[PDB]
Write a protein that holds these residues in place. Sequence first.
Motif, PDB file in Angstrom:
ATOM      1  N   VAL A  44      68.648  28.181 139.893  1.00  0.00           N
ATOM      2  CA  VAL A  44      68.245  28.556 138.766  1.00  0.00           C
ATOM      3  C   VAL A  44      70.563  29.363 138.437  1.00  0.00           C
ATOM      4  O   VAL A  44      70.834  28.433 137.268  1.00  0.00           O
ATOM      5  N   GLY A  47      72.476  27.516 137.976  1.00  0.00           N
ATOM      6  CA  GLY A  47      73.177  25.963 137.707  1.00  0.00           C
ATOM      7  C   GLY A  47      74.731  25.687 137.236  1.00  0.00           C
ATOM      8  O   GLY A  47      74.210  25.055 136.129  1.00  0.00           O
ATOM      9  N   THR A  49      74.763  28.662 136.500  1.00  0.00           N
ATOM     10  CA  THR A  49      75.264  28.452 133.991  1.00  0.00           C
ATOM     11  C   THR A  49      75.006  27.621 133.565  1.00  0.00           C
ATOM     12  O   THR A  49      76.755  27.602 132.546  1.00  0.00           O
ATOM     13  N   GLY A  50      74.704  25.916 133.673  1.00  0.00           N
ATOM     14  CA  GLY A  50      75.648  26.000 132.643  1.00  0.00           C
ATOM     15  C   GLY A  50      76.197  24.188 133.321  1.00  0.00           C
ATOM     16  O   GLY A  50      76.298  23.762 134.617  1.00  0.00           O
ATOM     17  N   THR A  51      77.905  24.568 133.229  1.00  0.00           N
ATOM     18  CA  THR A  51      79.153  25.611 133.723  1.00  0.00           C
ATOM     19  C   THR A  51      79.617  26.502 133.202  1.00  0.00           C
ATOM     20  O   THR A  51      80.675  26.917 134.279  1.00  0.00           O
TER      21      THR A  51
ATOM     22  N   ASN B   2      81.121  17.602 130.839  1.00  0.00           N
ATOM     23  CA  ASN B   2      79.625  17.996 129.750  1.00  0.00           C
ATOM     24  C   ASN B   2      79.513  19.831 129.724  1.00  0.00           C
ATOM     25  O   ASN B   2      78.763  19.850 130.654  1.00  0.00           O
ATOM     26  N   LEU B   3      79.842  20.766 128.989  1.00  0.00           N
ATOM     27  CA  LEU B   3      79.264  21.971 128.988  1.00  0.00           C
ATOM     28  C   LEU B   3      77.914  22.431 128.861  1.00  0.00           C
ATOM     29  O   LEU B   3      77.511  22.718 127.868  1.00  0.00           O
ATOM     30  N   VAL B   4      77.582  21.476 129.742  1.00  0.00           N
ATOM     31  CA  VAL B   4      75.537  21.630 129.726  1.00  0.00           C
ATOM     32  C   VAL B   4      75.328  22.646 130.156  1.00  0.00           C
ATOM     33  O   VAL B   4      76.417  23.917 130.441  1.00  0.00           O
ATOM     34  N   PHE B   5      74.355  23.607 130.206  1.00  0.00           N
ATOM     35  CA  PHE B   5      73.189  24.470 130.378  1.00  0.00           C
ATOM     36  C   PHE B   5      72.196  24.354 131.460  1.00  0.00           C
ATOM     37  O   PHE B   5      72.001  23.186 131.264  1.00  0.00           O
ATOM     38  N   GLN B   6      71.593  25.435 131.774  1.00  0.00           N
ATOM     39  CA  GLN B   6      70.645  25.150 132.344  1.00  0.00           C
ATOM     40  C   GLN B   6      69.362  25.814 131.947  1.00  0.00           C
ATOM     41  O   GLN B   6      69.942  27.188 131.878  1.00  0.00           O
TER      42      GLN B   6
END
Lengths: 51, 51
Positions: A44, A47, A49-51, B2-6
């Motif tokens: 996690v 992750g 940190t998302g990116t 894509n600046l995703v988050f987790q």
Amino acid sequence: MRGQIRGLEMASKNSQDGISLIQTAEGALTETHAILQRVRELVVQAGNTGT
Amino acid sequence: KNLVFQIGANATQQISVNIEDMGADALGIKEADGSIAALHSVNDLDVTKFA
């Protein structure tokens, strides 16, 4: 009868040794477990940190 | 990129983010059109063209 009693007592010893073995391996898997809990914290937290 | 988050401690529980501004970004024709629609922000046609 003495056959069965003696052999049975030593069998009780055998079984208690088995309890020892399984207790050891079990606690080992407990440590494995808690480590893998930390691993999921690091998947996690990794992750990206998302990116 | 894509600046995703987790988010979720399980899979797929992610967010999507959109970040696009720049000093070369102005009137959104599609992009920096020409001397106009991005570059009055940058080049500022008010030199003497505007006279």
